[PDB]
Symmetry: D2
Subunit: 386 residues, 4 copies
């Protein structure tokens, strides 16, 4: 029942199931996982692929010989399991050298080192077959107002992404970039805090068609925002290159709960949106098994990520296929929302007396929207009450 | 001391000082103000101009004769006082007909009526000399997930703004549009919730150069966002057409407190940003005198808006002019943040061994940012402790 | 399917279904309801009773003759339908005279008038058979720090409730008081913001056994708090006299959505808690049908309140009755949580070497909590996936 | 200027200035501090004393010989500097054994070990002369609803504190307990989330007079609550045994910024409250120097904690001493708030026709509160504009 298959495009970061359980007030509760182990267990659970930071796969400071050995180890695990590597990313946040950021660090030499660290992992990602390269600028920001001129930081961020886009085109690489927004933590405020801010920044890049967003469920909910609404605007702009699925209980620290947890109804409306729009990218889970769990609970949490998506997918499909729902959507004039407001043109609208001079404003105002019956129908479908 | 002059570009909405004090749980505590009265008292306080919704100046449903009479009344008050009208806007949120929105209402005929209501107030705004026309889509949104397909709503929102831009260019009007974002209230979630979302939406319009943002202090703080950071990104994109100043105490209902209230330090960093960047638009206060006040408290609150800006302007100017601060900014490498990361080019950065192979990552990591001394210097300057 | 009966103890405020749809940015979208009408339609839907503010039933300023007429009208509707009146309350927030509060208004004469308004509605509530009298101090608070000395306000709040408790005991009335907390709105900060603050204040009253709490789902979620946790502490103290059920989407304005909306999983854990603990009070819905609805949507929303509780009640009962869940609860040591930590006493614990000197801290640390499998089992039960 | 002296009662935790800068997404940026070093540098800065977790002073797992050596080292540093130890606490949150809590862990044997770990540090705290013992139950809580029965957990929490109170009285120790609330992080929801919840729980203990609260500025602001209001209720109940001062920027992760940062106006109203009420306990700073700082920035941040309190103390004292402010306080009827509402008694209030039958409700409603002029006067005083 609700069994994931590799064709479901479910992917996991090595840092997700491999999280040793270390939070700001406690030490690790689980031993480190061999990346080869994680690929094997995730393949057994029905996952389609894995993703990685450079430091997840190759320990920081490894020589060129150990690096090659670590990649050959990893490559063999992908060959033996049939697991893909659809996206890769850079760790520009863990080492103390990135404490003021990577691409927008105040120190110029740290910025230049951040670009070199990203570039050689882009080579590795392409060699592993990744189609998307994600950038989470978790250290780009500030705790105080004077520590960062945001206009200058935005110049340095545009410079870095323009240089990366110049690298991939000059190399012929078939890879696109996905900015992952986050409003805060670990910095007090992070640059490009939401999906909207990231989408606007992309329009100022040299080659905007190379860049999209990788939104995370919990990150937009850390700002109290409606995540399905943000995804819809990302899809509307044609910039949903990638997605991060997890759960979050409102505005607080980044929980990274398994998908389906947190705001359950928002997860239902997101799956309904992703499936109706025909999203064909990876279903990526950027989550953390709670440090209360042993390794059996780690794999149970990862399986719950995939199970919860499949249950919600079934409930959303039954919701849209219901003739009572389809009739209710017409009763709320969802069909009129899709119709153009003034396809007849500006001049016709200006001479249309039925639009103003002879508009019965009270008859229109008295028309109920019937949203509550429609929403209860969605609730019945989500809960399996019909 | 800290006396505003009309050259300070301080402006107020008629709906601000004219707010009768009616909240969702109580009736009005103040009588309605004659718009002529509001223009006279605000001019006496040192304000530079006023702004208005169409329904603030002309009562809804007024005939073409009373409309002209109401405008002639208003025009005479501007002539007798020297008060400008730099921005105007439309009330597409009060009447019950807009309960599901205006530009993105599900009913098509309400959308068409919303455009006609906006267009004829654009004519009046141009006749009154307004340079900016603001759109706050307070009713564009939903309380439930199925009530609104956001992709379709974004098509209807783009259609409306494209038609308005087509009207003003075909008429030769010298006026620009400023979208005012708000994350929620009165709707459960409002479309284009933050400055970033509005900036990204503008890049998909037919003539993006006609559209900017009118951010409000409290609205971005309703999402826990750093308002000075959002303004900097709006300035970075060259889209800060207008600004709304007020105060807000964190994530809750839209308080619309007087400017300087709420987050005082964030107000200091905003004034510092607005003045250093050379912002030359109106300093507009979209605030509400608390309903506990009589009319004497209304004018005291409005005066406090202008006083608080002038105090913060002086403290920010003394902050930047301090040689100890200038030396501290260099100690934190703010000068290096403004320097290009790789002006030598991609190829030079790739062959630069000092950027990676020979980068002393521990020496760079051990370099303190000295942000705390810089921030305490800003705190001393704000508090007048130096 | 999921049909409410009067024995389900479902109750509604007259102000809930009777909300005309007036928010801070719009006018009413529905006509006023006759209280007799509301009693009839709610009885047809399966509700058990209604509740009321004094101003909901008797218009403010009504003479002693119209007052009696309004009550006789209402009494006849209760007799014809079999509808109870389990709780009543006072409107100390709508009239402009309460703009600085009622029990803790700065003006003494307004405080004294607030007590007289409450007392004569206590008489009416007893005559109508109410067992609980609710106090929501929505206007007790401040927007600025100097406007209210909170220690003095807490003295005035204790004085008011002590006087009310002195009235009901001297009259022999069989009625108890329930304080309904709310963190903010309409005031910037409201006194006694959460369930905890109200519970602590009750312990300082003259006769604490006369006072309990009436928590609301959305109000505690306006502070980001876990509502099931707060109810458990209220039950733990034996002070859950009454409950307000609705929905809320995180930290924002008081949405008052229908129950089941907002945080669906938190609604499931609340119903599970209320039923397992044997809560026998009224299931009261303090909600607002969205102003987008006509009167048909009003009754659909009210029916959804009752339906959603019954669905969640069934899913929670199936959850606790599942042997796999019962075995999982033991695997997570929920049975050990209920066992006393040191029933052997302090001296025995001090001499117990197995508790410290010989405690294998690493063997205990390596024991997984198995919380994720338990939570996924709860998720399957909520979604009807088992 | 604004120089702290030991008589200012300023104290710091060893874990504050000693924080190595390790957050959930990065490694340490500073070496560990010798506790002897921290006592020396803090004494040079003008601090009055230090506080400690048991694991801050004695490394976890130390033998009885190294333990005594570590204490003798520490004792010598206190003797050479004149530094006090006013409060101590237990680390029941760092070791993996506490991953499900200490006093309310599901496993009984972990609960018993948590009590033994606390008890022997109570002995050490008394030997070092601490008057207050703080308990922060950072691990008492849950991430999911079924993982913890809160009623059972509250029984286990009451059992633990009753046993600790039984230990200190049976030993003749002169020490009191202060519960430090926190709404969340590291757990999804923490038991006793706010000051109110902790105050209510104390009233159910066996000897409530032994227990108070140790509120933290940022923790109550993590729930959007007004911290000065919470302190006033703690003072009103006579339970402000201790206080934690820091800064926090709204609802997000626990920032632990230096005091004065975050919400500056709320810091002003807190100092004004603490000084007017005559609070004589330690001024304790539970803060974290940002990991961007080296050790020079650590001591600059700690000095800023003390400086900011002294500046705010001066501005608040000048505020209350201003005759214009005193006259404004009377204009807003703050003197009437302190007057009893019905000192004449219930019977007199019932027969007082001027309180109801003859109360001019419109004349009272028309009286302005004059709160805005009072607040602007406070703003001028805070900013040094008068
Ligand atoms: Mg992510
Ligand atoms: Mg505005
Ligand atoms: Mg309620
Ligand atoms: Mg603390
Ligand atoms: Mn995350
Ligand atoms: Mn606003
Ligand atoms: Mn409510
Ligand atoms: Mn903290």
């Amino acid at each position: 029942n609700y069994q994931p298959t590799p064709e479901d495009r479910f992917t996991f970061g090595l840092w997700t199931v491999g999280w040793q359980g270390r939070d700001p007030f406690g030490d690790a509760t689980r031993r480190a996982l061999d990346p080869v182990e994680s690929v094997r267990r995730l393949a057994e659970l029905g996952a389609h692929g894995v993703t990685f930071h450079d430091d997840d796969l190759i320990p920081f400071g490894s020589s060129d010989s150990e690096r090659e050995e670590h990649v050959k180890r990893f490559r063999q695990a992908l060959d033996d399991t049939g697991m893909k590597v659809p996206m890769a990313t850079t760790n520009l946040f863990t080492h103390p050298v990135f404490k003021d950021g990577g691409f927008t660090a105040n120190d110029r030499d740290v910025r230049r080192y951040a670009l070199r660290k990203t570039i050689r992992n882009i080579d590795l990602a392409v060699e592993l077959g990744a189609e998307t390269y994600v950038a989470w600028g978790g250290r780009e920001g500030a705790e105080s107002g004077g520590a960062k001129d945001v206009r200058d930081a935005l110049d340095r961020m545009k410079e870095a992404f323009d240089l990366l886009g110049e690298y991939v085109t000059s190399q012929g690489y078939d890879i696109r970039f996905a900015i992952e927004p986050k409003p805060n933590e670990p910095r007090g405020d992070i640059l490009l805090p939401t999906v909207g801010h990231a989408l606007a920044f992309i329009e100022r890049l040299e080659r905007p068609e190379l860049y999209g967003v990788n939104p995370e469920v919990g990150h937009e909910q850390m700002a109290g925002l409606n995540f399905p609404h943000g995804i819809a605007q990302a899809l509307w702009a044609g910039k949903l290159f990638h997605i991060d699925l997890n759960g979050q209980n409102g505005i607080k620290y980044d929980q990274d709960l398994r998908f389906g947890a947190g705001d359950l109804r928002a997860a239902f409306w997101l799956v309904d949106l992703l499936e109706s729009a025909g999203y064909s990218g990876p279903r990526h889970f950027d989550f953390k098994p709670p440090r209360t769990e042993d390794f059996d609970g780690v794999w149970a949490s990862a399986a719950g990520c995939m199970r919860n998506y499949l249950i919600l997918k079934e409930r959303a499909a039954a919701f849209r296929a219901d003739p009572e729902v389809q009739e209710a959507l017409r009763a709320s004039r969802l069909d009129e929302l899709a119709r153009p407001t003034a396809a007849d043109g500006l001049q016709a609208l200006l001479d249309d007396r039925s639009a103003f001079e002879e508009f019965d404003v009270d008859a229109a105002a008295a028309r109920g929207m019937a949203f509550e019956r429609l929403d209860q129908l969605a609730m019945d479908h989500l809960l399996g009450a019909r």
